[PDB]
Motif scaffolding. Sequence first.
Motif, PDB file in Angstrom:
ATOM      1  N   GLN A  76      -5.690  -7.614 -13.873  1.00 15.58           N
ATOM      2  CA  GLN A  76      -5.968  -6.683 -14.954  1.00 15.58           C
ATOM      3  C   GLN A  76      -7.005  -5.682 -14.518  1.00 15.58           C
ATOM      4  O   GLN A  76      -6.825  -4.478 -14.693  1.00 15.58           O
ATOM      5  CB  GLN A  76      -6.437  -7.481 -16.186  1.00 15.58           C
ATOM      6  N   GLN A  77      -8.079  -6.159 -13.895  1.00 14.77           N
ATOM      7  CA  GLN A  77      -9.119  -5.291 -13.388  1.00 14.77           C
ATOM      8  C   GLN A  77      -8.659  -4.356 -12.250  1.00 14.77           C
ATOM      9  O   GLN A  77      -9.043  -3.201 -12.182  1.00 14.77           O
ATOM     10  CB  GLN A  77     -10.346  -6.107 -12.965  1.00 14.77           C
ATOM     11  N   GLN A  78      -7.803  -4.878 -11.375  1.00 10.82           N
ATOM     12  CA  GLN A  78      -7.190  -4.057 -10.402  1.00 10.82           C
ATOM     13  C   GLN A  78      -6.386  -2.882 -10.991  1.00 10.82           C
ATOM     14  O   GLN A  78      -6.449  -1.809 -10.422  1.00 10.82           O
ATOM     15  CB  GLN A  78      -6.310  -4.935  -9.524  1.00 10.82           C
ATOM     16  N   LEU A  79      -5.593  -3.144 -11.997  1.00 11.98           N
ATOM     17  CA  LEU A  79      -4.776  -2.095 -12.603  1.00 11.98           C
ATOM     18  C   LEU A  79      -5.672  -1.036 -13.194  1.00 11.98           C
ATOM     19  O   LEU A  79      -5.388   0.149 -13.072  1.00 11.98           O
ATOM     20  CB  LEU A  79      -3.830  -2.628 -13.631  1.00 11.98           C
ATOM     21  N   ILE A  80      -6.742  -1.492 -13.867  1.00 12.40           N
ATOM     22  CA  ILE A  80      -7.721  -0.523 -14.406  1.00 12.40           C
ATOM     23  C   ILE A  80      -8.376   0.325 -13.313  1.00 12.40           C
ATOM     24  O   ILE A  80      -8.500   1.534 -13.452  1.00 12.40           O
ATOM     25  CB  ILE A  80      -8.725  -1.234 -15.310  1.00 12.40           C
ATOM     26  N   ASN A  81      -8.779  -0.262 -12.191  1.00 11.75           N
ATOM     27  CA  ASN A  81      -9.333   0.473 -11.095  1.00 11.75           C
ATOM     28  C   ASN A  81      -8.311   1.402 -10.427  1.00 11.75           C
ATOM     29  O   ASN A  81      -8.609   2.470 -10.028  1.00 11.75           O
ATOM     30  CB  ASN A  81      -9.880  -0.506 -10.076  1.00 11.75           C
ATOM     31  N   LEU A  82      -7.064   0.934 -10.328  1.00 13.31           N
ATOM     32  CA  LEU A  82      -5.998   1.711  -9.750  1.00 13.31           C
ATOM     33  C   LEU A  82      -5.795   2.975 -10.586  1.00 13.31           C
ATOM     34  O   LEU A  82      -5.568   4.018 -10.024  1.00 13.31           O
ATOM     35  CB  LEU A  82      -4.653   0.885  -9.716  1.00 13.31           C
ATOM     36  N   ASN A  83      -5.859   2.857 -11.905  1.00  9.66           N
ATOM     37  CA  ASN A  83      -5.665   3.986 -12.801  1.00  9.66           C
ATOM     38  C   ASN A  83      -6.796   5.008 -12.520  1.00  9.66           C
ATOM     39  O   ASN A  83      -6.543   6.206 -12.533  1.00  9.66           O
ATOM     40  CB  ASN A  83      -5.702   3.515 -14.256  1.00  9.66           C
ATOM     41  N   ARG A  84      -8.002   4.546 -12.288  1.00  7.73           N
ATOM     42  CA  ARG A  84      -9.088   5.475 -11.944  1.00  7.73           C
ATOM     43  C   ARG A  84      -8.800   6.244 -10.649  1.00  7.73           C
ATOM     44  O   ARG A  84      -8.923   7.471 -10.610  1.00  7.73           O
ATOM     45  CB  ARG A  84     -10.417   4.719 -11.846  1.00  7.73           C
ATOM     46  N   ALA A  85      -8.320   5.544  -9.606  1.00  2.00           N
ATOM     47  CA  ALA A  85      -7.918   6.149  -8.380  1.00  2.00           C
ATOM     48  C   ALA A  85      -6.795   7.168  -8.560  1.00  2.00           C
ATOM     49  O   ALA A  85      -6.824   8.243  -7.994  1.00  2.00           O
ATOM     50  CB  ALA A  85      -7.521   5.091  -7.379  1.00  2.00           C
ATOM     51  N   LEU A  86      -5.798   6.831  -9.385  1.00  2.00           N
ATOM     52  CA  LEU A  86      -4.646   7.671  -9.638  1.00  2.00           C
ATOM     53  C   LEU A  86      -5.119   8.995 -10.313  1.00  2.00           C
ATOM     54  O   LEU A  86      -4.659  10.073  -9.917  1.00  2.00           O
ATOM     55  CB  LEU A  86      -3.750   6.964 -10.619  1.00  2.00           C
ATOM     56  N   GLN A  87      -6.040   8.894 -11.261  1.00  2.00           N
ATOM     57  CA  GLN A  87      -6.592  10.103 -11.931  1.00  2.00           C
ATOM     58  C   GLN A  87      -7.268  11.059 -10.944  1.00  2.00           C
ATOM     59  O   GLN A  87      -7.103  12.288 -10.985  1.00  2.00           O
ATOM     60  CB  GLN A  87      -7.656   9.707 -12.937  1.00  2.00           C
ATOM     61  N   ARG A  88      -8.034  10.477 -10.047  1.00  2.00           N
ATOM     62  CA  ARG A  88      -8.732  11.214  -9.028  1.00  2.00           C
ATOM     63  C   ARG A  88      -7.847  11.798  -7.940  1.00  2.00           C
ATOM     64  O   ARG A  88      -8.117  12.872  -7.402  1.00  2.00           O
ATOM     65  CB  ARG A  88      -9.780  10.273  -8.406  1.00  2.00           C
ATOM     66  N   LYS A  89      -6.768  11.093  -7.556  1.00  3.08           N
ATOM     67  CA  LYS A  89      -5.978  11.474  -6.378  1.00  3.08           C
ATOM     68  C   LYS A  89      -4.615  12.087  -6.670  1.00  3.08           C
ATOM     69  O   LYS A  89      -3.996  12.613  -5.766  1.00  3.08           O
ATOM     70  CB  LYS A  89      -5.746  10.266  -5.483  1.00  3.08           C
ATOM     71  N   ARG A  90      -4.169  11.963  -7.905  1.00  2.00           N
ATOM     72  CA  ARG A  90      -2.881  12.472  -8.346  1.00  2.00           C
ATOM     73  C   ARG A  90      -2.974  13.334  -9.593  1.00  2.00           C
ATOM     74  O   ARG A  90      -2.743  12.898 -10.729  1.00  2.00           O
ATOM     75  CB  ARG A  90      -1.932  11.294  -8.555  1.00  2.00           C
ATOM     76  N   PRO A  91      -3.309  14.623  -9.412  1.00  2.00           N
ATOM     77  CA  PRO A  91      -3.425  15.540 -10.571  1.00  2.00           C
ATOM     78  C   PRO A  91      -2.281  15.602 -11.576  1.00  2.00           C
ATOM     79  O   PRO A  91      -2.508  15.821 -12.767  1.00  2.00           O
ATOM     80  CB  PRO A  91      -3.627  16.920  -9.886  1.00  2.00           C
ATOM     81  N   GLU A  92      -1.057  15.465 -11.122  1.00  2.00           N
ATOM     82  CA  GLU A  92       0.096  15.396 -12.020  1.00  2.00           C
ATOM     83  C   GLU A  92      -0.067  14.279 -13.035  1.00  2.00           C
ATOM     84  O   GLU A  92       0.417  14.374 -14.153  1.00  2.00           O
ATOM     85  CB  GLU A  92       1.381  15.257 -11.187  1.00  2.00           C
ATOM     86  N   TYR A  93      -0.796  13.240 -12.669  1.00  2.00           N
ATOM     87  CA  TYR A  93      -1.071  12.156 -13.615  1.00  2.00           C
ATOM     88  C   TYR A  93      -2.316  12.412 -14.453  1.00  2.00           C
ATOM     89  O   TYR A  93      -2.333  12.045 -15.593  1.00  2.00           O
ATOM     90  CB  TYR A  93      -1.162  10.785 -12.938  1.00  2.00           C
ATOM     91  N   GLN A  94      -3.344  13.028 -13.883  1.00  2.00           N
ATOM     92  CA  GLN A  94      -4.571  13.224 -14.663  1.00  2.00           C
ATOM     93  C   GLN A  94      -4.189  14.065 -15.861  1.00  2.00           C
ATOM     94  O   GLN A  94      -4.675  13.876 -16.898  1.00  2.00           O
ATOM     95  CB  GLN A  94      -5.712  13.853 -13.849  1.00  2.00           C
ATOM     96  N   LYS A  95      -3.324  15.049 -15.632  1.00  2.00           N
ATOM     97  CA  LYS A  95      -2.994  16.040 -16.649  1.00  2.00           C
ATOM     98  C   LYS A  95      -1.978  15.533 -17.664  1.00  2.00           C
ATOM     99  O   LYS A  95      -1.669  16.218 -18.640  1.00  2.00           O
ATOM    100  CB  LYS A  95      -2.479  17.325 -15.994  1.00  2.00           C
TER     101      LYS A  95
END
Length: 201
Positions: A76-95
């Motif tokens: 669960q904690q991994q998925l939450i951290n992964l989502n933080r990484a995805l926001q930072r590294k994948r703009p199509e997702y942040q937006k």
Amino acid sequence: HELNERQMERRKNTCEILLSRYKRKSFLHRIVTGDEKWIFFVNGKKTMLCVWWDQSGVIYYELLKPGETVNAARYQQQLINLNRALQRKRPEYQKRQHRVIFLHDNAPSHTARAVRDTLETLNWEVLPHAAYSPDLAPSDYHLFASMGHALAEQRFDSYESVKKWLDEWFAAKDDEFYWRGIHKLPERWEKCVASDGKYFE
Ligand SMILES: Cc1nnc(C(=O)NC(C)(C)c2nc(C(=O)NCc3ccc(F)cc3)c(O)c(=O)n2C)o1
Ligand SMILES: [Mg+2]
Ligand SMILES: [Mg+2]
């Protein structure tokens, strides 16, 4: 592993569903995938690599402290951290222009109640995946297939030699290697359907 009837039926049926969706509208550029693998190092010790990636490269990974395993709370904690990484590294997702499609296997910590809740809250679409199907998991047939050959030549000393080796190894692969691994999916799905759910060549 000899697949039984239930297993081959689930594989064929899952591949039919994914392939027919793919044909209507390709979604492969929205897949984020991941899986765990043990990496060994002598002082008889091992550390679990947990990694997530897409057609652009590695998004996020953790190397667990020696001997420690992924349970429900850790995943669960991994998925939450992964989502933080995805926001930072994948703009199509942040937006929010693009919904994550998540492909992981059926390990019990992957389907536990708290994790299922967390995935619903993140609101990633969870792709169907059949049991005993690493041939249908890009982390297994592509990423760890390549990594395992290189690993076999290493004799790791420390948890941190592993981390550096992975940092370098991940970064040394061109964008095209990651892209190919994900875009192999439909040819795999087709083969599985043609195999009627058996393993294939
Ligand atoms: C089912 C079932 N039971 N054993 C397996 C299985 O697939 N084993 C082998 C070792 C093939 C395997 N496994 C996993 C994996 O995660 N295993 C944990 C898991 C447990 C239950 C479940 F439903 C799905 C996954 C890999 O990632 C992987 O690369 N391999 C090679 O499948
Ligand atoms: Mg796995
Ligand atoms: Mg695997």
